[PDB]
mmCIF file of C-alpha atoms and ligand atoms in Angstrom:
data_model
loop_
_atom_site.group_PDB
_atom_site.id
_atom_site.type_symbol
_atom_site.label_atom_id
_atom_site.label_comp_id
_atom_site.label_asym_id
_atom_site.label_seq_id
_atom_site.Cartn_x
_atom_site.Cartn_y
_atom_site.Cartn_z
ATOM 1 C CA UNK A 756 -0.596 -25.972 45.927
ATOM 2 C CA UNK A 757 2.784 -27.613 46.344
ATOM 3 C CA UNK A 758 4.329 -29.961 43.471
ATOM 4 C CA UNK A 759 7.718 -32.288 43.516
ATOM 5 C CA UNK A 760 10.255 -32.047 40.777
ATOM 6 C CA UNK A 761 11.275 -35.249 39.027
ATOM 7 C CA UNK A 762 14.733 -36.583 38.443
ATOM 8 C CA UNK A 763 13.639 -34.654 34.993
ATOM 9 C CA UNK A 764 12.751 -31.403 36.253
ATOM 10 C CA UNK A 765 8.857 -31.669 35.436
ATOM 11 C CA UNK A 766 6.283 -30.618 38.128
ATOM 12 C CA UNK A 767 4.132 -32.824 39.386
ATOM 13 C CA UNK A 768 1.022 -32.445 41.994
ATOM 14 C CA UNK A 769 1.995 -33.255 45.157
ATOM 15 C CA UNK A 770 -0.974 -35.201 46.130
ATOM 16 C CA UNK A 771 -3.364 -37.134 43.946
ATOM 17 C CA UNK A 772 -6.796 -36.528 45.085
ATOM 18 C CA UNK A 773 -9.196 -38.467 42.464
ATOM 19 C CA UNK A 774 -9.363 -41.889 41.408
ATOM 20 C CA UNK A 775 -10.953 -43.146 38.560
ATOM 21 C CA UNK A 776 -11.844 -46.580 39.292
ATOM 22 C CA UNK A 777 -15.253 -48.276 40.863
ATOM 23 C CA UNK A 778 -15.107 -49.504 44.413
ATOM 24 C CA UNK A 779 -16.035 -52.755 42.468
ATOM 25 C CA UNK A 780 -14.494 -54.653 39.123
ATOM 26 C CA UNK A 781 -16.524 -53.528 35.819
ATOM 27 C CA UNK A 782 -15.491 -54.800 31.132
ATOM 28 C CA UNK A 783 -17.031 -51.849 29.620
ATOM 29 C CA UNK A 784 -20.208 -52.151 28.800
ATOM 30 C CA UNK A 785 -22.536 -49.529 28.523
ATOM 31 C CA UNK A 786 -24.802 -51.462 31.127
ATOM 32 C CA UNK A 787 -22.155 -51.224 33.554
ATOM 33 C CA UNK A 788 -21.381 -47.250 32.922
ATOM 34 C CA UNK A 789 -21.549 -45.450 36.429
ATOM 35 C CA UNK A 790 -23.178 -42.281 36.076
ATOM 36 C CA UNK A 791 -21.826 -41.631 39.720
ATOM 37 C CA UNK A 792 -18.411 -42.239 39.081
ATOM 38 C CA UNK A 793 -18.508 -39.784 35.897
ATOM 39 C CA UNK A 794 -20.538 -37.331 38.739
ATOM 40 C CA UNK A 795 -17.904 -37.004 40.768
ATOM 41 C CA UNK A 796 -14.489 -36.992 38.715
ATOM 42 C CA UNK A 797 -16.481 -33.628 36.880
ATOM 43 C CA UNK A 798 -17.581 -32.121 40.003
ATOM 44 C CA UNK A 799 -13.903 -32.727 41.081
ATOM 45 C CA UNK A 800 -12.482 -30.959 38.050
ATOM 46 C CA UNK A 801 -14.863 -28.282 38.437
ATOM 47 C CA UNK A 802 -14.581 -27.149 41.853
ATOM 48 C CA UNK A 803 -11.132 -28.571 43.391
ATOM 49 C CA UNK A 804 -8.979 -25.670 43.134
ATOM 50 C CA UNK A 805 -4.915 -25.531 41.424
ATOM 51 C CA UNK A 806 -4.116 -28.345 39.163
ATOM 52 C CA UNK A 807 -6.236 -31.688 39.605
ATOM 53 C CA UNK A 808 -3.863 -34.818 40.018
ATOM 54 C CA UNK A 809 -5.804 -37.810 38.948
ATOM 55 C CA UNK A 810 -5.079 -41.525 38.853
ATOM 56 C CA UNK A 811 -5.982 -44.027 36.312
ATOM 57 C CA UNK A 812 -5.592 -47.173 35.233
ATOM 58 C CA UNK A 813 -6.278 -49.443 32.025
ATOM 59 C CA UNK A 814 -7.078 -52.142 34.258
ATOM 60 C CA UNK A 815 -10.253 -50.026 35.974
ATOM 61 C CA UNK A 816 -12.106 -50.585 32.647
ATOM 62 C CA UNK A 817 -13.136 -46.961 33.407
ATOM 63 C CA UNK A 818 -11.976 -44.497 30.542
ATOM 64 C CA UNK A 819 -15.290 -44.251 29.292
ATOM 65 C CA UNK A 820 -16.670 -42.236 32.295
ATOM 66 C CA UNK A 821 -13.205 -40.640 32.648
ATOM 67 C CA UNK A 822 -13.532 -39.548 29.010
ATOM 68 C CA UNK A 823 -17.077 -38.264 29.286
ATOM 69 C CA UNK A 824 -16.242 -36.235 33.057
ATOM 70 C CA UNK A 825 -12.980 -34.547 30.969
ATOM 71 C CA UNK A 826 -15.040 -33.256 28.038
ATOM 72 C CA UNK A 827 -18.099 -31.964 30.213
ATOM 73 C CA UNK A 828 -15.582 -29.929 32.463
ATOM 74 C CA UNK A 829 -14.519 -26.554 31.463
ATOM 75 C CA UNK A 830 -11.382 -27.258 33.742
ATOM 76 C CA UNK A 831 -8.690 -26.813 31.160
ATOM 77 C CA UNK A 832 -6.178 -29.520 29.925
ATOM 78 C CA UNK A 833 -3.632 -27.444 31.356
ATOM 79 C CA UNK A 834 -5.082 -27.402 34.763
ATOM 80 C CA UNK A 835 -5.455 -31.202 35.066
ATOM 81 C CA UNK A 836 -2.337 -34.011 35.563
ATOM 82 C CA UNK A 837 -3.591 -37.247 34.366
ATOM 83 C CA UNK A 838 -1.725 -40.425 35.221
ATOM 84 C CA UNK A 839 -2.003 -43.724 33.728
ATOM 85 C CA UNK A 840 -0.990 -47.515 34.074
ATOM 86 C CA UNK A 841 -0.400 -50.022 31.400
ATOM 87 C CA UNK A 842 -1.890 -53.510 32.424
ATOM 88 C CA UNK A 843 1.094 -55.881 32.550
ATOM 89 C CA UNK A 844 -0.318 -58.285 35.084
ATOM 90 C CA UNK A 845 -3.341 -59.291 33.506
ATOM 91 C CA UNK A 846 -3.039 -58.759 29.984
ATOM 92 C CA UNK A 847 -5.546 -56.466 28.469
ATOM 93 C CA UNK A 848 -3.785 -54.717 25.536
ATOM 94 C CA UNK A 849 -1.135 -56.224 23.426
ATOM 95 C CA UNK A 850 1.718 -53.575 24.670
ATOM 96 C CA UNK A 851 1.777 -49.945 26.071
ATOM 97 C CA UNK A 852 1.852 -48.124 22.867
ATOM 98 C CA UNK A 853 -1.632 -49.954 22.165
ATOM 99 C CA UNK A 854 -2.935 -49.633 25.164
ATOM 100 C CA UNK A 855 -1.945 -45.810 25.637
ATOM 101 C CA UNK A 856 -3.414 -45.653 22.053
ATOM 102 C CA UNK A 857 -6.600 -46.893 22.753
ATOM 103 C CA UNK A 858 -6.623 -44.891 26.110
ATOM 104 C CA UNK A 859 -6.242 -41.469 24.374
ATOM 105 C CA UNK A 860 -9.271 -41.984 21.969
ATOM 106 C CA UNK A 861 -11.387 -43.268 24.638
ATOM 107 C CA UNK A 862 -10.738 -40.382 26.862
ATOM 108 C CA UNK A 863 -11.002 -37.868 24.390
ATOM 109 C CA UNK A 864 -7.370 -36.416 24.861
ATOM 110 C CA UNK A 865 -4.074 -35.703 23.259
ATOM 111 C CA UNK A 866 -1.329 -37.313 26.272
ATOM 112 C CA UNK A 867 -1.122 -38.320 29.547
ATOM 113 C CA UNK A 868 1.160 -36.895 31.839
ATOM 114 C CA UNK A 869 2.375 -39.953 34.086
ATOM 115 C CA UNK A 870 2.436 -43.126 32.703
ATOM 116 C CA UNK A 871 3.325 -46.644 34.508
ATOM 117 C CA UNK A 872 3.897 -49.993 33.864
ATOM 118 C CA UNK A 873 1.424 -51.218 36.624
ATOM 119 C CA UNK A 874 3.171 -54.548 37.840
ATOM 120 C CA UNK A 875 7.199 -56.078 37.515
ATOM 121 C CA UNK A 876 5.473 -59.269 36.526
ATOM 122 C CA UNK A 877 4.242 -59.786 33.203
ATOM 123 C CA UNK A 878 1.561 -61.800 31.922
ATOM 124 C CA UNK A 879 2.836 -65.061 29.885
ATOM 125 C CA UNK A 880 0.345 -64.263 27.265
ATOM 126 C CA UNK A 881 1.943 -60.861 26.662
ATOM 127 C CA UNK A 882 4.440 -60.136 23.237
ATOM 128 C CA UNK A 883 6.759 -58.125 25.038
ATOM 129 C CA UNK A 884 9.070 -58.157 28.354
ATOM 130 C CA UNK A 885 9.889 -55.761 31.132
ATOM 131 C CA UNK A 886 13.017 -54.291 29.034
ATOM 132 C CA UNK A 887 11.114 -53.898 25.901
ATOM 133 C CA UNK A 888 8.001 -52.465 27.217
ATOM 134 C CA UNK A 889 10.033 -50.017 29.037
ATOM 135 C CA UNK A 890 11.435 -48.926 25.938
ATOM 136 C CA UNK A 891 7.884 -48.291 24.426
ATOM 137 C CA UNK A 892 7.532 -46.047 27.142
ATOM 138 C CA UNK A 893 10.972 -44.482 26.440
ATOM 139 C CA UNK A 894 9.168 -43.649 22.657
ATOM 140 C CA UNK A 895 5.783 -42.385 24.313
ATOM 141 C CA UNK A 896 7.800 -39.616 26.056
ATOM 142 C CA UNK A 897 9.753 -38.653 23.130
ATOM 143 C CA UNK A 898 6.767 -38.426 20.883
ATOM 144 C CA UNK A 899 4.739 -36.633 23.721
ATOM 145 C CA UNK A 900 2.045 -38.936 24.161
ATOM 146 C CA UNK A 901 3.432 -39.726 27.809
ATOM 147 C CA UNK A 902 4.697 -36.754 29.467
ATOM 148 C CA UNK A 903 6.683 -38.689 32.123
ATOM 149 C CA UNK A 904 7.477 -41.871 32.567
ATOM 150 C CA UNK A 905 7.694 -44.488 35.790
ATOM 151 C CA UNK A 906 6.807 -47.766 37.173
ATOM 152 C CA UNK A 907 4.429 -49.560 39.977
ATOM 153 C CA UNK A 908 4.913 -52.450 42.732
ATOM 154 C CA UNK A 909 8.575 -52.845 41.939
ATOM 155 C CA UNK A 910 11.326 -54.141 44.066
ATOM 156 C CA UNK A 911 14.749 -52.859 43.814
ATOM 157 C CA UNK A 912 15.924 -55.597 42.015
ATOM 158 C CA UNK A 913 12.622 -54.930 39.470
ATOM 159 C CA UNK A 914 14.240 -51.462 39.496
ATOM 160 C CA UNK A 915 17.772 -52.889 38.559
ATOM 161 C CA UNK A 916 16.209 -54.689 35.583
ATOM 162 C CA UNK A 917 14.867 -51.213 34.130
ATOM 163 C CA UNK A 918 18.079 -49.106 34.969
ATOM 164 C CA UNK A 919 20.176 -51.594 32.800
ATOM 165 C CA UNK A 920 19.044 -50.886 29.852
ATOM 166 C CA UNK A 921 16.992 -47.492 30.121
ATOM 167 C CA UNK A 922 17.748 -44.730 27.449
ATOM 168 C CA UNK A 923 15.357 -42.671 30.055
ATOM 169 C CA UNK A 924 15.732 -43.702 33.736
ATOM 170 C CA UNK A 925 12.247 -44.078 35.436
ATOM 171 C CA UNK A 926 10.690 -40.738 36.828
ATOM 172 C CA UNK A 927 8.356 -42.827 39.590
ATOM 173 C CA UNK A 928 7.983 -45.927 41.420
ATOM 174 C CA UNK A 929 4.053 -45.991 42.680
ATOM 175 C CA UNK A 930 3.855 -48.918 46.138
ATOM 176 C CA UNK A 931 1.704 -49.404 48.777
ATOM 177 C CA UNK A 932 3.020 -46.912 51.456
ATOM 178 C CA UNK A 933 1.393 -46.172 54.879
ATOM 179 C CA UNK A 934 2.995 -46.107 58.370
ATOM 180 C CA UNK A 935 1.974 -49.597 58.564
ATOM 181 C CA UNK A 936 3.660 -50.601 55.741
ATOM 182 C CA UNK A 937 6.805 -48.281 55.287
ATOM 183 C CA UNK A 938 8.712 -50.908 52.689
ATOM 184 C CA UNK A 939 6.450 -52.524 50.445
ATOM 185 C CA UNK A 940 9.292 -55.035 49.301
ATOM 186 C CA UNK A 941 13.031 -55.094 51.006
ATOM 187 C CA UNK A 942 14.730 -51.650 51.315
ATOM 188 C CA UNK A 943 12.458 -49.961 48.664
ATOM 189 C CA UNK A 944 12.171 -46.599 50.120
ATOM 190 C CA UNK A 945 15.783 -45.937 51.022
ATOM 191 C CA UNK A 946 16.838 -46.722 47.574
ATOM 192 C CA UNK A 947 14.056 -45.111 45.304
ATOM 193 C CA UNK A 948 14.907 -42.271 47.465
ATOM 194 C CA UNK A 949 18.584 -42.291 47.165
ATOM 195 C CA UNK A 950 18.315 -42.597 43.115
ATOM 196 C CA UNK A 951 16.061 -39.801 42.737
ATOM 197 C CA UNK A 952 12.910 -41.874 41.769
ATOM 198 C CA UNK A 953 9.550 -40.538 43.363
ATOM 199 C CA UNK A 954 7.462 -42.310 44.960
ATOM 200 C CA UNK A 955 3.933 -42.304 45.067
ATOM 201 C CA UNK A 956 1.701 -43.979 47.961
ATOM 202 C CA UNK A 957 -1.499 -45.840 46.944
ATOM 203 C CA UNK A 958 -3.366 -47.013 50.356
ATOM 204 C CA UNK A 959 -1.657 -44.105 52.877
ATOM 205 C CA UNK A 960 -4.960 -44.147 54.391
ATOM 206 C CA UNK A 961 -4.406 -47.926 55.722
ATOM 207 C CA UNK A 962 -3.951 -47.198 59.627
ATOM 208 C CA UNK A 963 -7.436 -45.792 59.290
ATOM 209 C CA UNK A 964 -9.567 -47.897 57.369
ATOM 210 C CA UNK A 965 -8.850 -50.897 60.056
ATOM 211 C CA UNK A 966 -9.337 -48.619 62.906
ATOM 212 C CA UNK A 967 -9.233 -51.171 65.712
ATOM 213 C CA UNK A 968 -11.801 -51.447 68.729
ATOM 214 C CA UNK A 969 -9.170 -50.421 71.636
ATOM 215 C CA UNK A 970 -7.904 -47.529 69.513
ATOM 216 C CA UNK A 971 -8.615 -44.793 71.830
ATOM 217 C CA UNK A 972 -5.564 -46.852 73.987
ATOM 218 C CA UNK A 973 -3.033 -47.400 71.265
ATOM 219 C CA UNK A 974 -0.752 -44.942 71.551
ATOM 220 C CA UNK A 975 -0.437 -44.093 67.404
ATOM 221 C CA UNK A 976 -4.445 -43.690 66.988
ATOM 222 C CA UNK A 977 -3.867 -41.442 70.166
ATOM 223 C CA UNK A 978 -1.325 -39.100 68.786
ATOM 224 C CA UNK A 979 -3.034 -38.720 65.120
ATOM 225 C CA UNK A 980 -6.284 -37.484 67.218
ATOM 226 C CA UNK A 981 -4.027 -35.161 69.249
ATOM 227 C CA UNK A 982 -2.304 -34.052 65.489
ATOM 228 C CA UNK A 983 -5.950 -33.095 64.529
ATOM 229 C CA UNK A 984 -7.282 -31.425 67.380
ATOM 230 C CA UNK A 985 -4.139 -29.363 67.284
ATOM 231 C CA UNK A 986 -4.568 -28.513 63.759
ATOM 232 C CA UNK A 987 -8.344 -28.310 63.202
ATOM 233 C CA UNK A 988 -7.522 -30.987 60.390
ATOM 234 C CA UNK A 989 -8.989 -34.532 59.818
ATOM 235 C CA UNK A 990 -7.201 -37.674 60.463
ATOM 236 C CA UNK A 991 -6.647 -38.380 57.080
ATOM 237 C CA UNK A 992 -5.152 -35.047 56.431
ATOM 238 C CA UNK A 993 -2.759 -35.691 59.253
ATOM 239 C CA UNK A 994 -1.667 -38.888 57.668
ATOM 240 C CA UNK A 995 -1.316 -37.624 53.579
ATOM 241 C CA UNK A 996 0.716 -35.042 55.112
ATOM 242 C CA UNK A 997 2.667 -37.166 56.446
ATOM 243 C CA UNK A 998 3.417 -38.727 53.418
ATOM 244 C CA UNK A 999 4.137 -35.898 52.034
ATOM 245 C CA UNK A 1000 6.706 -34.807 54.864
ATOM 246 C CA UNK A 1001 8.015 -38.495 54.304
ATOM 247 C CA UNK A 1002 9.253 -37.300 50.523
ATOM 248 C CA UNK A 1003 6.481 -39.301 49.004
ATOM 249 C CA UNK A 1004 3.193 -38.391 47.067
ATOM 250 C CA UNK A 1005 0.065 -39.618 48.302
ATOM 251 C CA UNK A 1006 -2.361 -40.974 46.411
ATOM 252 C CA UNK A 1007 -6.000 -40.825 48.134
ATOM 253 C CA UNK A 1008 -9.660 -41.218 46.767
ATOM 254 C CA UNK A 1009 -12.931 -40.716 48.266
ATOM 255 C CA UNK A 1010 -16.715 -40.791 47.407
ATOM 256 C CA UNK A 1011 -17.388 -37.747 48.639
ATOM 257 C CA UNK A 1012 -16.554 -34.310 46.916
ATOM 258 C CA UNK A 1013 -15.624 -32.078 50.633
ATOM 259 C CA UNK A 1014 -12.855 -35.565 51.725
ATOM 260 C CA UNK A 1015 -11.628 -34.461 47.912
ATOM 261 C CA UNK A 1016 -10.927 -30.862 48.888
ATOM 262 C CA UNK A 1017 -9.697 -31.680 51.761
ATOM 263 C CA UNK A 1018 -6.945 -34.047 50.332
ATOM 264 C CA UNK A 1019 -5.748 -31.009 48.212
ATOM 265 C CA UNK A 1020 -5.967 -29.146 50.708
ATOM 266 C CA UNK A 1021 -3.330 -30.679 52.939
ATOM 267 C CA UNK A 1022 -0.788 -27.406 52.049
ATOM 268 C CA UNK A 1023 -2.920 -25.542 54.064
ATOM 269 C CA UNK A 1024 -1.015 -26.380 57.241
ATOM 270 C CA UNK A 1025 2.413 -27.812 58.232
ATOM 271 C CA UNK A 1026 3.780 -30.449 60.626
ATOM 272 C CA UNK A 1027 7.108 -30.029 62.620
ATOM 273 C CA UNK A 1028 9.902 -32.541 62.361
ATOM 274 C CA UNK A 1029 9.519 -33.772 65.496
ATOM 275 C CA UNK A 1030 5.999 -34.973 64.299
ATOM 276 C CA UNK A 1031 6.858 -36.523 61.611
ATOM 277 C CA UNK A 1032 9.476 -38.291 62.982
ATOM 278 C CA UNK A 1033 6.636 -39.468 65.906
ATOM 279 C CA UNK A 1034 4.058 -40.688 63.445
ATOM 280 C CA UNK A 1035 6.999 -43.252 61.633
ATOM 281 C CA UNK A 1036 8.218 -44.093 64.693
ATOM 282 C CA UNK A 1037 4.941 -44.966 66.470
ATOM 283 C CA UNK A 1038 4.162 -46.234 63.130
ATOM 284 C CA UNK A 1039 6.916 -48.850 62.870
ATOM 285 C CA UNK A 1040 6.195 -50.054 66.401
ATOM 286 C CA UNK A 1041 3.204 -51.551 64.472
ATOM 287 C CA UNK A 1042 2.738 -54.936 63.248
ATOM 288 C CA UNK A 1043 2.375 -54.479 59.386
ATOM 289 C CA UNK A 1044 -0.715 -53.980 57.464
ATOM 290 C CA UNK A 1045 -0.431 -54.937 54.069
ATOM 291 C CA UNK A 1046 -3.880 -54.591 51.772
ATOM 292 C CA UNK A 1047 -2.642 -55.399 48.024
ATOM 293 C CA UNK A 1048 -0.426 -57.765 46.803
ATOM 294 C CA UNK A 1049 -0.479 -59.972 49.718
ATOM 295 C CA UNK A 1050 -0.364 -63.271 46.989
ATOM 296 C CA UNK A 1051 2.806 -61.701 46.130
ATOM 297 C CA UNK A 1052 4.736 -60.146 48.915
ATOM 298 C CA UNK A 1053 3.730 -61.256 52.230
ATOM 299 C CA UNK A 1054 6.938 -62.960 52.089
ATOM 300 C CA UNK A 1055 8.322 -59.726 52.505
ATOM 301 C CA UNK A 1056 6.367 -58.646 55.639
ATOM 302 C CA UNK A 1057 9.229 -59.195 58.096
ATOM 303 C CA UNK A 1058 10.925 -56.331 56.279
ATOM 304 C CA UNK A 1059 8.264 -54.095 55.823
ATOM 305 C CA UNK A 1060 8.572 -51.990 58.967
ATOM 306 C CA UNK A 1061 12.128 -52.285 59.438
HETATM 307 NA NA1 LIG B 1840 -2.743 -52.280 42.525
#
């Protein structure tokens, strides 16, 4: 199992392998409990070996079956990196110490051990601004309760706003990263890079979930078959690899409990530099997909894979 070091010297699990959220909006009600959600975060934990990387979010409206999967594991605490996302967006708590608050007793646990603000744009109906809810966060990791600290869908400038008047500079920045879409926002990966922020990918597996019809003559689709023949890997592996090799943490999901293994599983084998270097470049010879956040940021789409 392979881990980055933060700007803060704390491990963290390379890849991210679970989700936590329903491939539809729930609020929580017990009518709307998934039993098969709950089924397969506990299977995860159970039988995915090394540390389990998950990924959360307050705006799921899923700690409940998060909470009940963590206590009917016998995968220790110790063996399982849980990150979390304050709901700045839409408003859902009145501020992070709240929401992390309420987040702990629903889930049956003592800390998180990544915790974002989830969006640079805050809901009007919200007490509290960027600055100040960053400096809630700068409290939750000195009391413990977070046990690093970063951000989500921010722009450099977003960044700029946080580094002014941090006590504790931010650990992550989590974007939409695939080689379709290799700057979310102007410039972001350069300079998240060059400041010793990680970044995490949400949506690496773009290229193939809108697999085109002609793909067997396009050149990229061609290459990432050729990767897995080679390899004896999946597609998918190929590409959070790639990530990886990129400097960058993938974050992947699936329904089904062998695509999980196989996402932690992506230290198993190795890619050259020369292949990396062919998957970006064939990559950013591609139009750019962009699946979240297109209200906001298609305006940014002419810089996305430059
Ligand atoms: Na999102």
């Amino acid at each position: 199992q392979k881990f980055f070091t933060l700007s803060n010297g704390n491990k963290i699990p390379a890849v991210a392998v679970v989700g936590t959220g329903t491939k539809w909006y729930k609020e929580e009600t017990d009518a709307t409990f998934s039993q098969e959600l709950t089924d397969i975060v506990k299977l995860s934990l159970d039988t995915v070996p090394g540390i389990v990387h998950i990924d959360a979010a307050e705006t799921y409206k899923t700690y409940p079956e998060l909470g009940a999967a963590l206590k009917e594991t016998k995968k220790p605490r110790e063996e399982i990196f849980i990150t979390d996302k304050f709901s700045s967006l839409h408003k859902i708590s009145e501020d992070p110490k709240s929401a992390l608050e309420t987040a702990l007793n629903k889930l049956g646990v003592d800390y998180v051990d990544l915790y974002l603000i989830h969006s640079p744009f805050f809901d009007k109906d919200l007490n509290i601004d960027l600055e100040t809810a960053w400096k809630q966060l700068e409290e939750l990791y000195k009391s413990g309760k977070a046990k690093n600290i970063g951000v989500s869908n921010f722009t450099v400038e977003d960044l700029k706003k946080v580094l002014a008047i941090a006590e504790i500079k931010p650990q992550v920045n989590q974007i939409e990263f695939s080689p379709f879409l290799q700057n979310q926002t102007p410039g972001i990966v350069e300079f998240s890079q060059k400041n010793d922020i990680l970044l995490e990918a949400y949506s690496p597996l773009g290229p193939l979930q809108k697999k085109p019809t002609d793909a067997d003559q396009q050149p990229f689709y061609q290459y990432l078959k050729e990767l897995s023949e080679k390899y004896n890997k999946t597609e998918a592996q190929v590409l959070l690899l790639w990530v990886y090799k990129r400097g960058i943490l993938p974050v992947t999901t699936s329904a089904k409990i062998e695509r999980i293994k196989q996402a932690q599983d992506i230290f198993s084998f190795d890619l050259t530099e020369e292949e990396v270097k062919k998957i970006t470049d064939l990559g950013l010879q591609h139009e750019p997909v962009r699946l979240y956040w297109v209200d906001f940021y298609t305006k940014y789409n002419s810089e996305a894979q430059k």
